[PDB]
Write a protein that binds this ligand. Sequence first.
Ligand SMILES: C[C@H](CCCC(C)(C)O)[C@H]1CC[C@H]2/C(=C\C=C3C[C@@H](O)C[C@H](O)C3)CCC[C@]12C
Length: 254
Amino acid sequence: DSLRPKLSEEQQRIIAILLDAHHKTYDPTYSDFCQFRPPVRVNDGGSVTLELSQLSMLPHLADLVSYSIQKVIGFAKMIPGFRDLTSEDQIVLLKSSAIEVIMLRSNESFTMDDMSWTCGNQDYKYRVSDVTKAGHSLELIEPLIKFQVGLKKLNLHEEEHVLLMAICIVSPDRPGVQDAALIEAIQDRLSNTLQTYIRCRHPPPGSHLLYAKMIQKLADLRSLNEEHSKQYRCLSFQPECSMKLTPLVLEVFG
Ligand SMILES: C[C@H](CCCC(C)(C)O)[C@H]1CC[C@H]2/C(=C\C=C3C[C@@H](O)C[C@H](O)C3)CCC[C@]12C
């Protein structure tokens, strides 16, 4: 039974637009990372106290996340439809989705060889231990790694990955959005592009369950977003934390 309509010419052009936007905003060589404040790994082999006392990886990771937010804002601008929104909604959407899109886009440096984000170059291989040296706890980190493994095992085509990031950004149910209807219209155009693509371009397919899986990842990201927000708020109570962050990070997560 299941029909397999072909991608319209407009859908194909959406896909091409989104691949080009990603290629313009995600350097797969990580060649800017040497410009960030450097990573420092104090031995905390075991401690929340040590660690909040040092936050040795926070300057480097905050610069990394700050840089990623900028690339994401650049990616968003190229999403077909996004600029038809009011700038107030554009920013609501970017601010509420930023950490989720960072978590998604980070899947490209994530490796199941050793369960790290390998952006280098050894200095820029990030593990669970680095995330705890930036003041976060296992209640964020463990489900983050689960999410990364789950996403990897979907073996998404790049077309799927960039569509999934766009759909994440353009979510009509973010708090504070005004024109939810327009946002939903933009998102549906993207979601239809993704369903059609999966059905006509993705083999075998007994992965017609792929679309529901991807949608579930969006749900998972929502939970990670609330847990992140909870921890960031506590982290920010550390005296002089702000010096280790950036103005853009302060604004987005504050
Ligand atoms: C939870 C943490 C962000 C915490 C930021 C803070 C401000 C301290 O709350 C995660 C989110 C994404 C994670 C990682 C890498 C992300 C990227 C981003 C992407 O834009 C390029 C590359 O893929 C590395 C591994 C370290 C741990 C990172 C930074």
